[PDB]
C-alpha cells in the first residue's frame, strides 16, 4: 500500500499555526503529538506561522536537505500554502518531492480526514483524528498524491491539494466565521434562501487521447480566451447550485463526499448539482454525505464524473470560489491534474 518510507530515525520540520483549534494547536501538539514522536525516534523543530503568506515564504526559502519531512499542523489552508511555496521555488522539481505530513488542528481538515480513511481507520474527529494522523507519521509510510494546477482569468497560476468549489459550497465556506460544526449551520441557513449560480462548465473525462493541444506545463489546457478543445464535454445546463472538483475522499472530517473509490494517478472527482433540486433533497444529500451514502439516492440533479481537467466560467461578472477552503474571486478558472506529484505520509 505504501510507496515509500521516511528513514528511522529522522528529523522533521513542524509548521504550526497557534491560532488553530480555537488557539490550542500548540497545546494539542504538546499533549497529543510530541509524546508519540519521542517513542518513534522522530526529532522535530516547531516553527510558528500565523500571519498571511508566512509559511509560504519560509518554505520557499528553506534548505530542504536538513529535513526528512515537513509536517503541517493546522488545516487544509496551511498545506495549501506549503505546497504553493514549494512549487514557487526555482528548484520546484526536487523541492516538491519532500514528504509532507498533514496533522489536523483547526477546522477544514479534509486532507487529514481522507488520509485517515485511506489508512483504514474509522471516520474519527478532533483529537482522535489528530492521534490517528500522528500514528501514520510514526509508521513512516509514504504515498504519492495528485496536484491540481489552476489558472484564473486575471492570469494567476496556483496549486490545489484538495478541492476547488463554486456556488453553494463556496458561499458557505465564506459565510462561516465560527469555531463550532459551522458547515452544517452554514448549509442550513444558506439553504433557506437557496440560490442558483449561472455559469459555463466544461471538463475532460478520463477518456482523453494519444495527443493533445514556471512550474510544469498544463498540456491539456488552452488559454481561457480560446474555447475548450472539441473533445471535451461542455455541460448544457448553465444554472448550478454547486460545482466541486475534489482530489480526495473527504470534503471535511465528517463529509465522505467521494465513496466511489480513491482517485487514480492524474484523475480527480468532479461533482456538480444542476439547478432544480429541492432544499430538502440538498439537505438529505448533505446529511447522507456523513456516511458516504448520498450517491445511493440516484438524484438526477447530482452529477459525478472522473476528470483530468475542467473549465468553469461565471457568467455575471466575478464568481466566488473556495480553493482548498480559502477564498478566491475570479471571472474564470480552469485546471488540470498532475499525477502523483508530491508525497505524503499515509498507511
Ligand atoms: O465546505 C462545505 C461543504 C459542504 C457544504 N454544503 C453542502 N454540500 C453539499 C454537497 C452535496 C453533494 C456533494 Cl458530492 C458534495 C456536497 C450539499 S450542501 C458547504 C460547505
Coordinates of C-alpha atoms and ligand atoms in Angstrom, one line a residue:
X1 CA 0.0 0.0 0.0
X2 CA 2.9 2.4 0.9
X3 CA 5.1 3.6 -1.9
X4 CA 8.0 5.0 0.2
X5 CA 9.3 5.4 3.7
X6 CA 10.7 8.0 6.0
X7 CA 14.1 6.9 7.5
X8 CA 14.1 5.8 11.1
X9 CA 15.4 7.8 12.8
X10 CA 14.5 11.0 11.1
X11 CA 14.1 14.7 11.7
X12 CA 11.0 16.7 10.8
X13 CA 10.1 20.3 10.4
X14 CA 6.7 21.1 12.1
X15 CA 4.9 24.2 10.9
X16 CA 2.1 25.1 13.3
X17 CA -0.4 27.9 13.3
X18 CA -1.1 28.6 17.0
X19 CA -4.5 30.1 16.2
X20 CA -5.7 26.6 15.3
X21 CA -8.2 24.5 17.3
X22 CA -9.5 27.7 18.9
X23 CA -5.9 28.7 19.7
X24 CA -5.0 25.3 21.2
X25 CA -2.9 23.9 18.4
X26 CA 0.4 24.1 20.3
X27 CA -1.1 22.6 23.5
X28 CA -2.6 19.8 21.3
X29 CA 0.9 19.2 19.8
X30 CA 2.4 19.0 23.3
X31 CA -0.3 16.7 24.6
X32 CA -1.1 14.5 21.5
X33 CA 1.8 14.7 19.0
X34 CA 5.0 15.2 20.9
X35 CA 4.9 12.0 23.1
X36 CA 4.3 9.8 20.1
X37 CA 7.2 11.3 18.2
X38 CA 9.6 10.6 21.1
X39 CA 8.7 6.8 21.0
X40 CA 9.0 6.7 17.2
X41 CA 12.5 8.3 17.3
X42 CA 11.2 11.3 15.3
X43 CA 13.0 14.5 16.2
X44 CA 11.4 17.8 15.2
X45 CA 11.6 21.6 15.4
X46 CA 8.5 23.8 15.9
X47 CA 8.1 26.9 13.8
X48 CA 5.1 29.1 14.5
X49 CA 3.3 30.5 11.5
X50 CA 0.2 32.7 11.8
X51 CA 0.4 35.8 9.5
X52 CA -0.6 35.6 5.8
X53 CA 1.9 34.2 3.4
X54 CA 4.3 33.4 6.2
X55 CA 4.6 29.7 5.9
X56 CA 4.7 30.1 2.1
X57 CA 7.8 32.4 2.4
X58 CA 9.5 30.1 4.9
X59 CA 9.1 27.0 2.7
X60 CA 10.1 29.0 -0.4
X61 CA 13.4 29.9 1.2
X62 CA 14.1 26.7 3.3
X63 CA 17.1 24.4 2.9
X64 CA 15.1 21.2 2.5
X65 CA 18.1 18.8 2.9
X66 CA 18.0 19.3 6.7
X67 CA 14.5 17.7 6.8
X68 CA 13.2 14.2 6.1
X69 CA 9.6 15.6 6.0
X70 CA 7.7 18.8 6.6
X71 CA 4.8 18.3 8.9
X72 CA 2.0 20.8 8.7
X73 CA -0.3 21.3 11.8
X74 CA -3.3 23.5 11.1
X75 CA -5.9 22.9 8.4
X76 CA -6.1 22.3 4.7
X77 CA -5.3 26.0 4.3
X78 CA -1.7 25.6 5.6
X79 CA -0.9 22.6 3.4
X80 CA -2.1 24.8 0.6
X81 CA 0.4 27.5 1.4
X82 CA 3.2 25.0 1.9
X83 CA 2.6 23.2 -1.4
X84 CA 2.4 26.5 -3.2
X85 CA 5.6 27.7 -1.5
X86 CA 7.5 24.6 -2.8
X87 CA 6.1 24.9 -6.3
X88 CA 7.0 28.6 -6.4
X89 CA 10.7 27.7 -6.0
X90 CA 13.2 27.7 -8.8
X91 CA 14.1 24.2 -7.7
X92 CA 10.5 23.0 -7.6
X93 CA 11.1 19.7 -9.4
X94 CA 13.1 18.4 -6.5
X95 CA 11.5 20.6 -3.8
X96 CA 8.0 19.1 -4.4
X97 CA 9.5 15.6 -3.6
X98 CA 9.9 16.4 0.1
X99 CA 7.4 14.2 2.1
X100 CA 4.6 16.2 3.6
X101 CA 2.5 15.3 6.6
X102 CA -0.9 16.7 7.5
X103 CA -1.7 16.9 11.2
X104 CA -5.3 18.2 11.8
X105 CA -5.8 21.1 14.3
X106 CA -8.3 23.7 13.2
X107 CA -11.4 23.2 11.0
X108 CA -11.1 22.2 7.4
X109 CA -9.2 19.0 7.8
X110 CA -10.5 17.3 4.7
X111 CA -7.0 16.2 3.7
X112 CA -6.2 14.7 7.1
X113 CA -9.6 13.0 7.1
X114 CA -9.1 11.5 3.7
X115 CA -5.7 10.0 4.7
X116 CA -7.1 8.7 7.9
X117 CA -9.8 7.0 5.7
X118 CA -7.3 5.6 3.2
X119 CA -5.4 4.0 6.1
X120 CA -8.5 2.1 7.1
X121 CA -9.5 3.9 10.3
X122 CA -13.0 4.9 11.3
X123 CA -14.2 8.3 10.5
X124 CA -13.0 9.8 13.7
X125 CA -12.9 13.5 14.7
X126 CA -11.0 16.2 16.6
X127 CA -8.4 14.7 19.0
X128 CA -8.9 11.2 17.8
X129 CA -8.2 12.4 14.2
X130 CA -5.0 14.2 15.4
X131 CA -3.9 10.9 17.1
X132 CA -4.6 8.8 14.1
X133 CA -2.6 11.0 11.7
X134 CA 0.3 11.2 14.1
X135 CA 0.3 7.4 14.2
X136 CA 0.5 7.5 10.4
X137 CA 3.6 9.8 10.7
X138 CA 5.0 7.4 13.3
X139 CA 4.6 4.5 10.9
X140 CA 6.5 6.4 8.3
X141 CA 4.8 5.1 5.1
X142 CA 4.7 7.4 2.1
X143 CA 2.1 7.6 -0.8
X144 CA 2.3 9.9 -3.9
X145 CA -0.7 12.3 -4.4
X146 CA -2.2 14.2 -7.3
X147 CA -1.9 18.0 -7.5
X148 CA -4.3 20.4 -9.2
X149 CA -2.9 23.2 -11.3
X150 CA -5.3 26.2 -11.7
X151 CA -5.4 29.3 -13.9
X152 CA -7.6 32.3 -13.4
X153 CA -8.8 34.9 -15.9
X154 CA -6.5 37.6 -14.3
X155 CA -3.5 35.3 -15.1
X156 CA -2.8 33.8 -11.7
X157 CA -1.5 30.3 -11.6
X158 CA -1.8 28.4 -8.4
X159 CA -1.9 24.9 -7.0
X160 CA -4.6 23.0 -5.1
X161 CA -4.1 19.9 -3.0
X162 CA -7.8 19.1 -2.2
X163 CA -10.6 21.0 -3.9
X164 CA -12.0 23.8 -6.0
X165 CA -15.6 24.6 -5.1
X166 CA -18.0 27.0 -6.6
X167 CA -21.6 28.1 -5.7
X168 CA -23.3 26.8 -2.6
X169 CA -20.2 25.2 -1.0
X170 CA -18.1 28.3 -1.7
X171 CA -20.8 30.6 -0.3
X172 CA -20.9 28.6 2.9
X173 CA -17.1 28.3 3.3
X174 CA -17.1 32.1 3.2
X175 CA -20.3 32.7 5.2
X176 CA -18.7 30.7 8.0
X177 CA -16.9 32.7 10.8
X178 CA -17.1 30.3 13.7
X179 CA -15.5 27.6 15.9
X180 CA -18.4 25.3 16.1
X181 CA -19.8 22.3 13.1
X182 CA -20.1 25.6 11.3
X183 CA -20.6 23.9 7.9
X184 CA -23.9 22.2 8.9
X185 CA -25.1 25.5 10.4
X186 CA -24.0 27.4 7.3
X187 CA -25.5 24.9 5.0
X188 CA -28.8 25.0 6.9
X189 CA -29.2 28.8 6.7
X190 CA -27.9 29.2 3.1
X191 CA -30.5 26.5 2.3
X192 CA -33.2 29.0 3.4
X193 CA -32.9 31.5 0.6
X194 CA -31.4 28.9 -1.9
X195 CA -29.9 30.5 -5.0
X196 CA -28.6 29.1 -8.3
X197 CA -25.4 30.3 -9.9
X198 CA -25.2 31.0 -13.6
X199 CA -22.1 29.6 -15.3
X200 CA -20.4 27.5 -18.0
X201 CA -18.8 24.2 -17.2
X202 CA -16.5 22.2 -19.4
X203 CA -14.4 19.2 -18.5
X204 CA -12.1 16.5 -19.8
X205 CA -13.2 13.0 -18.8
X206 CA -10.7 10.2 -18.3
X207 CA -11.4 9.5 -22.0
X208 CA -8.5 11.6 -23.4
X209 CA -6.4 10.7 -26.4
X210 CA -2.9 9.9 -27.9
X211 CA -2.1 13.5 -28.5
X212 CA -3.0 17.0 -27.1
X213 CA -3.3 20.7 -27.7
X214 CA 7.3 28.4 -14.2
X215 CA 6.2 25.0 -12.9
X216 CA 5.0 22.1 -15.1
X217 CA 3.2 22.6 -18.3
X218 CA -0.6 22.2 -18.4
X219 CA -0.7 20.3 -21.7
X220 CA -4.4 19.7 -21.5
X221 CA -5.3 23.4 -21.2
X222 CA -5.8 26.1 -23.8
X223 CA -5.9 29.8 -23.0
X224 CA -9.2 31.0 -21.3
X225 CA -9.8 33.3 -24.3
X226 CA -9.9 30.2 -26.6
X227 CA -12.8 27.7 -26.5
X228 CA -12.1 24.3 -24.9
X229 CA -10.9 21.6 -27.3
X230 CA -13.7 19.8 -29.2
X231 CA -13.0 16.5 -27.4
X232 CA -14.1 18.0 -24.0
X233 CA -17.6 17.8 -22.7
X234 CA -19.4 21.2 -22.5
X235 CA -22.2 20.9 -19.9
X236 CA -25.5 22.1 -21.4
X237 CA -27.1 23.4 -18.2
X238 CA -25.9 26.8 -17.2
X239 CA -27.6 27.1 -13.8
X240 CA -26.0 25.3 -10.9
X241 CA -26.3 25.1 -7.2
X242 CA -22.7 23.9 -6.9
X243 CA -19.6 22.6 -8.8
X244 CA -16.9 20.7 -7.0
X245 CA -13.6 19.5 -8.1
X246 CA -12.2 17.1 -5.4
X247 CA -8.9 15.2 -5.3
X248 CA -9.7 13.1 -2.3
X249 CA -12.5 11.1 -0.5
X250 CA -13.4 13.7 2.1
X251 CA -14.6 17.3 1.9
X252 CA -14.4 17.6 5.7
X253 CA -13.8 15.3 8.7
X254 CA -17.4 14.1 8.6
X255 CA -18.1 14.5 4.9
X256 CA -17.3 11.3 3.0
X257 CA -18.1 13.1 -0.3
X258 CA -16.4 10.6 -2.7
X259 CA -17.2 7.0 -1.7
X260 CA -16.7 5.5 -5.1
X261 CA -13.0 4.5 -4.8
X262 CA -9.8 6.5 -4.4
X263 CA -8.6 8.6 -7.3
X264 CA -6.2 7.0 -9.8
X265 CA -2.9 8.8 -10.8
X266 CA -3.8 12.0 -12.7
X267 CA -7.6 11.8 -12.1
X268 CA -9.8 13.9 -9.9
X269 CA -13.5 13.8 -9.0
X270 CA -15.9 16.3 -10.5
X271 CA -19.3 16.9 -8.9
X272 CA -22.0 19.3 -9.9
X273 CA -25.6 19.9 -8.8
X274 CA -27.8 21.3 -11.6
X275 CA -30.5 23.9 -10.7
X276 CA -33.8 22.2 -9.8
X277 CA -33.2 20.3 -6.6
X278 CA -35.5 21.0 -3.6
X279 CA -34.0 22.4 -0.5
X280 CA -34.9 19.2 1.3
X281 CA -33.0 17.0 -1.2
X282 CA -29.9 19.1 -1.0
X283 CA -30.0 18.7 2.8
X284 CA -30.7 15.0 2.5
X285 CA -27.7 14.7 0.2
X286 CA -25.7 16.8 2.7
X287 CA -26.6 14.6 5.7
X288 CA -26.1 11.3 3.8
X289 CA -22.6 12.6 3.0
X290 CA -21.6 11.8 6.6
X291 CA -21.8 8.0 5.8
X292 CA -21.0 8.4 2.1
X293 CA -24.5 7.4 1.2
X294 CA -25.5 10.4 -0.9
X295 CA -24.8 8.6 -4.3
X296 CA -27.3 6.0 -3.2
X297 CA -30.2 8.5 -3.7
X298 CA -29.5 8.3 -7.5
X299 CA -30.5 12.0 -7.5
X300 CA -30.7 13.2 -11.2
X301 CA -29.6 16.7 -10.3
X302 CA -26.3 15.4 -8.9
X303 CA -23.7 14.5 -11.5
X304 CA -20.4 12.8 -10.8
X305 CA -17.6 12.4 -13.5
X306 CA -13.9 11.5 -13.1
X307 CA -11.9 14.1 -15.0
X308 CA -8.3 15.2 -15.7
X309 CA -9.1 18.9 -16.4
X310 CA -12.1 21.3 -16.3
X311 CA -13.1 24.9 -17.0
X312 CA -15.7 27.0 -15.2
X313 CA -16.8 30.4 -16.1
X314 CA -19.5 32.6 -14.5
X315 CA -21.3 34.4 -16.2
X316 CA -22.4 37.6 -14.5
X317 CA -19.0 39.2 -13.7
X318 CA -16.8 37.6 -11.0
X319 CA -17.6 34.4 -9.0
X320 CA -16.5 33.4 -5.5
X321 CA -14.6 30.1 -5.3
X322 CA -13.0 28.2 -2.5
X323 CA -9.6 26.8 -3.2
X324 CA -8.7 24.2 -0.5
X325 CA -11.1 26.2 1.7
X326 CA -9.5 29.6 1.1
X327 CA -11.5 32.4 -0.6
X328 CA -10.8 33.2 -4.3
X329 CA -12.6 35.7 -6.6
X330 CA -12.4 35.3 -10.4
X331 CA -14.1 35.7 -13.8
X332 CA -13.0 32.2 -14.9
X333 CA -10.9 29.3 -13.7
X334 CA -9.7 26.2 -15.3
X335 CA -7.3 23.5 -14.2
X336 CA -5.7 20.1 -14.8
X337 CA -4.5 17.3 -12.5
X338 CA -0.8 16.4 -12.4
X339 CA -0.3 12.8 -11.3
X340 CA 1.5 11.6 -8.2
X341 CA 3.3 15.0 -7.9
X342 CA 4.0 15.1 -4.2
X343 CA 4.5 12.6 -1.4
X344 CA 2.6 12.4 1.9
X345 CA 2.7 10.2 4.9
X346 CA -0.1 7.7 4.9
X347 CA -0.8 4.0 5.6
Ligands
LIG1 O1 -17.4 23.1 2.8 C1 -18.7 22.8 2.6 C2 -19.1 21.5 2.3 C3 -20.4 21.3 2.1 C4 -21.4 22.3 2.1 N1 -22.7 22.1 1.9 C5 -23.3 21.2 1.1 N2 -22.6 20.3 0.3 C6 -23.4 19.5 -0.4 C7 -22.9 18.5 -1.2 C8 -23.7 17.6 -1.9 C9 -23.1 16.6 -2.7 C10 -21.7 16.5 -2.8 CL1 -21.0 15.3 -3.8 C11 -20.9 17.4 -2.2 C12 -21.5 18.4 -1.4 C13 -24.8 19.8 -0.3 S1 -24.9 21.1 0.8 C14 -20.9 23.6 2.4 C15 -19.6 23.9 2.7

